[PDB]
Amino acid sequence: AFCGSENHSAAYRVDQGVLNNGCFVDALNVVPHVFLLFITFPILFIGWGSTWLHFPGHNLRWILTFMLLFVLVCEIAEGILSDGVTESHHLHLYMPAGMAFMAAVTSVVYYHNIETSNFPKLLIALLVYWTLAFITKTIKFVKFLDIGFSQLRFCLTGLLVILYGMLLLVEVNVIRVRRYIFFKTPREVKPPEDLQDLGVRFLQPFVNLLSKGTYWWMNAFIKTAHKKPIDLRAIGKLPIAMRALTNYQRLCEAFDAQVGARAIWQALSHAFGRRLVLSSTFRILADLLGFAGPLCIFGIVDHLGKVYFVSSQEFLANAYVLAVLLFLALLLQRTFLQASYYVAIETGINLRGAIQTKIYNKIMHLSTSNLSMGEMTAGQICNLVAIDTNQLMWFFFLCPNLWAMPVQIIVGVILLYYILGVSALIGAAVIILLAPVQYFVATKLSQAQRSTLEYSNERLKQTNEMLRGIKLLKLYAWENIFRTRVETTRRKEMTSLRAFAIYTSISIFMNTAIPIAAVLITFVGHVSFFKEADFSPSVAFASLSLFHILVTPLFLLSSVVRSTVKALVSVQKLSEFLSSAEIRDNCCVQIMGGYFTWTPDGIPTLSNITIRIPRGQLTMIVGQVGCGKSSLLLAALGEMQKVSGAVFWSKRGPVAYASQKPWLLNATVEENIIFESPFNKQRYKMVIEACSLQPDIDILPHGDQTQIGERGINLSGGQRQRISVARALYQHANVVFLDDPFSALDIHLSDHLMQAGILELLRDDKRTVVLVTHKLQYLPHADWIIAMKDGTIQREGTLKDFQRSECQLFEHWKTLMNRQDQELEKETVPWRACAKYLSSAGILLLSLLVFSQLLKHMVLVAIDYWLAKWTDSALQTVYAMVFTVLCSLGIVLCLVTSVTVEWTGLKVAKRLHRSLLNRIILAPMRFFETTPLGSILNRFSSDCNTIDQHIPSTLECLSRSTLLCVSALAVISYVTPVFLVALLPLAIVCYFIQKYFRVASRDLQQLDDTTQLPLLSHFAETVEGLTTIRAFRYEARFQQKLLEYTDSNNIASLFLTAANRWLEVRMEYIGACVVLIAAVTSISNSLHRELSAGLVGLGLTYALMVSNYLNWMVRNLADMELQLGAVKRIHGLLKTEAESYEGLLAPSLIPKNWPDQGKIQIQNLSVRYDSSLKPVLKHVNALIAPGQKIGICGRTGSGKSSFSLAFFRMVDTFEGHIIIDGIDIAKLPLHTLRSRLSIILQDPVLFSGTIRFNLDPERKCSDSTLWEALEIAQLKLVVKALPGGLDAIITEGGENFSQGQRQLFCLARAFVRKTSIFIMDEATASIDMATENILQKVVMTAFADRTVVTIAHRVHTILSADLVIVLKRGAILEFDKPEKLLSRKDSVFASFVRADK
């Protein structure tokens, strides 16, 4: 009944005034709301009962609408509470506020449906609705001036006046800007820069404020992952402010706006400063809203111990009112927290997208003398993209936590002083004792985290250069030596990881033990000294919850201080890399007087080279090894540092460079032959037909579209060089720089690539060809022969200019191809990985881990179940004598948990890298050939980085959070068992989100992985072929190709971020509902039944614990499920094969001098590479004398290298005997066989280190035998002219020297062994003819008694052999003396030596 039912004839009657009545204004302020409702719901019926742009004042109108909803929800509560004093139900108290609550939601729904459709004239209803109701609240505010500031409804209607007037001022802030009524200029603003037309599906900035906090736009994206899975071009593009190009520009303006390692920090606080400020303000607001939970736990438990308006003191002294106020505080704190998290993470993603483009822009100007001679490697650069940029991004996720922790500590100490008293100071300085100690171990971490990222980096050198040369380590039996070399660095890294793990264990122990020591010294330091300071369950379970909420930042301070040390050395390495070295009449190039140098401080490698290159004519650069050929090619491009002289051109213009070491993309065969050029089919066919690449293309599995490169099918040695040559013949570049292309090709391919190609594709089409070559038989075909000697050019000009003026190098050319009886002239033309993590820990450590974390939280509950038996006894010192022995059992059961977590996380990571390193070495070469090296290196680089450094923290956070959430649901179901009835229809709802989330999580997790991999692959392939890219002038195109990758990675990271925040805000809303339920069923159980009021505070404290640690349990469970995939991949690699190193023969029967007379008898041998392939050799029979010098010649693909590898059992021999010295070769251990036979591969496989290390990694032979085995490799004068002499530094891959001196260094490496069987698999390929003719005469005199099997590149060097093998497609075609083979004149050997004269 309205206006009461007591029948006093005073509220129904209006005599002295119809407006002066105490009632009837409650009857008057409803018809504005029913006016709005009954004219708004027709518009919802006729308009919406069947490229969006926000109106201005959007965030202010939504914030004022939420404040209006909160004040109306308080006014309904004031009406219901003020009715309870009366005898009956006075309807005029709760109905006029309830109708306004029903109409305000309708008003904000109406405003959103108007703004999303751009119907601004339809706001005229909202023009008037915020006037008259405001007017109807104004009279109700001024007729209440009879009751001021001591009655609650006075302040409530004053707030209603202020909110309605503010909404009216925002409403008139729409007509005056987007004019719809009473104006002549309808200033229609544009849609948001057409960001809905470009195909952006992110929609997070272009959403209303309710969908920005609850991520409601994401709720449609989870529902459509169940039907069709999420792919790229379904998450759309990026918005115009989150692109890497526009995030890179604001990084550059910050760098230019200030003209070191602090310049980046001032450049990151200027570009991305206000966004971190905004996220820190969201974190601060969530902190201040978190400091209203314990105030409600104070007020509720303080209530349980003890004119129709209700005073404002007796409103905040109610219990259900404080419960719903705590619920509405948690509901807004939990969304301010996610609003902080999203802004911080999107700022980190924009930072990553900016600094990756800055690193690439440094790469495109990077001098290659940094990579080659000295400082950095390619793996170091791809590490500072993959690891260092990710660490700097992960710092930006926690920088608002670092900025908003001390304000939480300060407000907690002030509120603790207000609640408990000066005894809070007893619990304050102890927390202040946590301030330098968490700094102190920080300094210790700044040692250890600066050491591990040193040592592991060196390990990622020594692993990688092992794997990329693993075949040579499996051919010299050096694999155990290199495995011990990596194990030493791994041991020195595990020492630093122990020193880091001990200090982060004591940091975790400090962060978890300083709160409980504070609780102990505060609660016993209260009842001992100040026994009259009002000890009560209210103040006890308020200050205990404040101590708990001062331990929620300490849940993350250890991870914050762990992550801010890895991001200072990150920006230190980034500043070290960004300020490194950089580059700056019918003739193409006309160098004159130019001294060029590789090292900036040293002798110039080229000296006074005054050359000229004719246009459209083939010019040849010939000379010895180390003579300046590739350096002269790289001085015209500008890669070498110019000291003096001039370099003219035609700016340069693009050339077609094909380097001495071929460089392949991670793309198909077609896509790195055309190389970002227009595809012309006829020119492509003429290119691959002149290169004779078509029969090698047909054997490939997909033909023209098979993914070759590093992360794909491993090609041969000549196929990749022919592809890299074929790239250069497809450019219209008009000047071709063909560095030595005949290294891996044989005679029949080289004579076809020289006739068609260099003489027919580039001499018909008048393109300048500059051909570095060692094949002097093509010296007739040149128009300008350049001849170098020790860097300086010796002579240039035609063959007439060389036979008339030089006449000594000319005769030296003529006696090199034995053409003395001729003339040189120009031609007139859970999972199992979790058990693997738990079985590699050991049962003694695992039972000490499980049964000491269930024992800590069974103690921590008894620490909080006591003080509920104590403070109920406060309404006597034996309660405090057993509280110290429980608080000391929460420290000594904390230290053991924090040490066994890190002990487990270290003992697993030691056991999981040694067991992987010992198994990768034992794997057969077929495993290294098929599977890409990028995967095997990523299991050593990233997964062995997340196992030791991320899982022992994630496991600790997961175990602590899930045990707090389990032990917190077991005591709010003990004090209120009715909560169990309310647990079942909600907790399974948690399951019914998580399953419903997971098919959109595990989908979107696989776009943050399969889009980061091409980004890292592009960063790896832009460094290996940097000189090739900068010579084609494809720097801008490759920068655009970077931007198109990092944008697609950034959008896939942003969608995963938004999905995570969607799930987390839903889980925290369920947690807030848990707090509301467990507060209501504790209050209503203590007011009716007798819950003794301490159990109510206990249940309230642990309900707040559920709200805090439900989301951390969910997040750490998802993070453990993500990080266990690394253990799964390592366990996948750990179950690989073995090469069967044991032999069928006991080592007592193999003599000490095993191949004492190399007497290799081969009978019916046939090899294969894998059991599904054709036999490479077939029925080969050969008998070799104990001192013969057999040579092997044949075409490419005949099986020459398979014959060479058949002695070392690197090919699957399935039929046939190889018997040496009467002892079979299959019944032999592999480390006995391979360490007593030598082989020189065609490719140089030099490792980084020193000359003495590369010649022998064991340091077993003397120093003088490293010189006799260097004098015969034609390198004594080169090594003796080095600064170090011996022990001079060879850098990674051997790039410090040439590709001729590299092959000479591998030849000298094989000559230090005193074995009696030698195999030379085309060793003299990169070496010139003069040095080869010297080297053969020194080798076949010093090794005058050793059996040498020489796979001959140029078959004119093999005529001095005793016997000659001619392979032709498998089986041996000819096997006789070379004179008897040449006497036939129709034999294949006489055919082979005919094409080389």
Ligand SMILES: Nc1ncnc2c1ncn2[C@@H]1O[C@H](COP(=O)(O)OP(=O)(O)OP(=O)(O)O)[C@@H](O)[C@H]1O
């Ligand atoms: N990338 C490099 N960084 C530093 N020094 C180099 C590099 N390349 C070569 N050198 C030095 O410069 C000298 C000239 O080598 P160059 O670059 O001319 O190779 P090259 O002689 O053309 O190769 P080849 O022996 O196949 O002809 C060598 O003695 C070597 O020590």
Ligand SMILES: Nc1ncnc2c1ncn2[C@@H]1O[C@H](COP(=O)(O)OP(=O)(O)O)[C@@H](O)[C@H]1O
């Ligand atoms: N690692 C490998 N895996 C599979 N097949 C191979 C491998 N190496 C060589 N082959 C095959 O063996 C044949 C001859 O190989 P090889 O002896 O290396 O060539 P060449 O005699 O020209 O040096 C080739 O046709 C090639 O297809």
Ligand SMILES: [Mg+2]
């Ligand atoms: Mg060279």
Ligand SMILES: [Mg+2]
């Ligand atoms: Mg070969």
